[PDB]
Symmetry: C6
Subunit: 188 residues, 6 copies
């Protein structure tokens, strides 16, 4: 709808890599998250199965091993990497309404925050889920589960495929931002 119209304006104001490659990969990630990945995680808790009769053990074991869902993490990441661009668009429009360094300092800082947000969320993915591969079986001993209980994840393989996809694209977006930084560094 209006999203592509809005992205058209920010498309008209960027650099070689920024106009084309960064914008395409950003839309690439949104399409994957929306049309494909969001329904892989639909039954994440409904189809989580634990071999026990203890009431409440399923709730605490799912919450222990999935403190925040993968799709919610990716939704937050896309929002954080798109706000610096949104700020520049309004900042330029505000400057136009009133009417080198002013735009240069904002634009350079704008791509600096995207690298930080991109790397921070990638780091969170690794430490929180201990690698990018999801297991079929999780062993849970949190109260009130008696001793250790076996619980089984829903669609672990398909979730691994989409996890590798999102991580790979995010890593590419980091490299593109770094090269854009170098092109504005050699300019001096």
């Amino acid at each position: 709808g209006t999203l592509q119209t809005i992205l058209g304006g920010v498309n008209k104001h960027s650099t070689s890599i920024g106009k084309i490659w960064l914008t395409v990969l950003f839309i690439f990630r949104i399409m994957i998250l929306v049309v494909a990945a969001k329904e892989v995680w639909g039954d994440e808790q409904a189809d989580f199965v634990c071999n026990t009769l203890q009431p409440g053990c399923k709730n605490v074991c799912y919450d222990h091993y999935f403190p925040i869902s993968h799709i919610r993490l990716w939704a937050l990441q896309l929002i954080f990497v798109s706000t610096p661009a949104l700020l520049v668009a309004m900042h330029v429009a505000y400057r136009r309404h009133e009417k080198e360094g002013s735009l240069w300092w904002t634009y350079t800082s704008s791509i600096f925050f995207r690298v930080i947000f991109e790397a921070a969320f990638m780091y969170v993915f690794y430490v929180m889920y201990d690698g990018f591969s999801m297991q079929r079986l999780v062993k849970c001993n949190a109260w009130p589960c008696p001793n250790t209980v076996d619980c089984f994840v829903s669609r672990p393989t398909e979730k691994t495929v989409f996890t590798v996809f999102m991580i790979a694209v995010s890593g590419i977006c980091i490299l593109l931002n770094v090269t854009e930084l170098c092109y504005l560094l050699i300019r001096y």
Copy 2:
């Protein structure tokens, strides 16, 4: 759709902080509530589990500990902090149709109500839920539950993460409004 078009008009009529930072944080909260948080709370009652055989104990215990859902509280808060801006937009448009102090008094009062509504809802969150952290286990003794019954919350950790997020952003919006008040106070 038309929401960003409407927000464009109120964007053209504000001050330095108001045009950019307050508008972005407002859109920031809406995006989190809509695309991410609204489906964390989807199974709040369906996956609420109580260790009992008493019919009706689950209904009364959920109602006792969640008198109003977090997402409904945030939906009300966003509506209340956006109506003073909506009133100004129509008030100015009405003034334009007919055609310093008149706009100054409205604008100053407009940011005064936003601070009150923002703080009031933040206060309600603290007293009603006793802090911003959701527990795995709630103990319930309301009739008809016999003695005290253990009940287990769905996704307590993910709900805590989004609760901290919404509270933190709301606190920032309060500070931005206060600074805008100071800039219009030193003007005299």
Copy 3:
């Protein structure tokens, strides 16, 4: 979408209170009904629990105590209070296509029907549900329930909060319409 565009036209043709305050409160009620209240009532019958083994007792007890849902009553009320405005918009447009008293008599009658419809639905709410507070427990003795059966309502407290909200706003809309009537009465 187009709803705000349509409301813009009727905004350009009204009086001081009518242009701003009545229009805002009308949009205020629609937002509450759509984005917040409509999913409080989602599981009204699914989570209605009765302490019995009699087949069909749940169906007849829910139907006895909720002959028409609150959200359906509010949906009907908003439609009825918006059609007199819709009639005027087409009546004026028809008059414009062909091309004081003619518009005055229609406009005065237009706000007269809104008061009647607003008060009629408020009266129905009171008599049908016996006050604006929803109870946790309902006692039901309709056939085929044996003797008297205890049944438990879903989310009674949250439904009470939204009921008080909609009633309070509707009462304010009545007062605004009455004042508009007085302003057109003192004119003579």
Copy 4:
């Protein structure tokens, strides 16, 4: 969206009653069907309860007493009463593209089909469901149900309220069409 834009064109081409009253009542019926009535019938078969252990008896008893749902009947009726208007709109547009009696004969026939379709569907409602009141209990003896089985309808009272509403409005639309016919009859 575009529906009101399309209805605006046919609004500009009609008569006194046709431009305003018939168009409003048509939109009145669509709003009731869409925003309110369509979710009263959502659990029509899911909450249909029969007092039996015979497999398949629930399927045949629901199908016997509800050969076609009320909402599907109303959806068909609205489509049938809106196509004669749609034909005229394209027929006039086609005539405009190429460029008294020609339009008069089409317009007069156009309101003649609406009366027939309106009355035909109203007749079907009466004979198929034996009045406009829905009962709590239906007795079913179709195979494979043993002897006669008691089955219980979901939300019979709320469905009766909306049935009376749709029938009453349809009867009014018939009267408006007849008066329009008389105005074009006295013209001669």
Copy 5:
């Protein structure tokens, strides 16, 4: 939305029957499929009931008697009868961009494919489902069902009503296309 805008362009480029009657019946079928029929088939497998204890017998019996759902067959048919029109629209637009027989041969062939696709899908409906009437009871003896198992269809009568409706309209569309062929045949 944009669908009626697109259909407006192809409306401006057709013949007497093609501009009006064929276009209306095509929209007539889409409306029935979308707003009414698509939710009759919603619980086709969920409410399919078999009188057995054999695991997997329900899956194989439903798959045996409904190799492809009616609504999916109609969705494919509408796509196939609308692509020849879509090809002509782009072919003409391409010809316009570059800038009797060329358009005549395409248009004549365009209505020739619609007749073939319309008749082919109607033939598939008859052979696959053995007439246009759906039965309440199906007897199934595919492995792993022991001996012959009784299974019961959901909403057989309502599905029969919509099946007769779609078949009747499709047969009318065939006759309209044939008459258009004759009008272009007598021209010579």
Copy 6:
């Protein structure tokens, strides 16, 4: 909505086959995936039935035989075959903003990536699912299933019909791209 407007621009910039046939088949695949196929796979795991009492055996057997769903594979394929066209559209627009071989090399490479992506996904379909026919019965011996367990697929025949459809259209799109390559090869 805006998708057809965007496709209109890329329609105006292509060759004979590319403007018409490749664009139509691309829209042909999207329509099938969206309006028809996406709800065949809706209950892929909900209606997956295994003849066992072992907890967790259903989760591991479904994950073993469907590592990634067919609809998710097709969603990825459509995204990958549409990005080279999207890159060209922005690359040309960027060139227009600044202002033979430059466009020729991009366009020729653009159709070269589409052939590679089209063939790669078709190869994945064959090796992963061992042909294009889905079976009613799958035998599963992954841990924790004891010995070998019989499991039954939901709607195997309808999924086979749509699988053959998508594969056949993709093979045609490969042939069209190859012919376009030959036309640009004989040019030299």
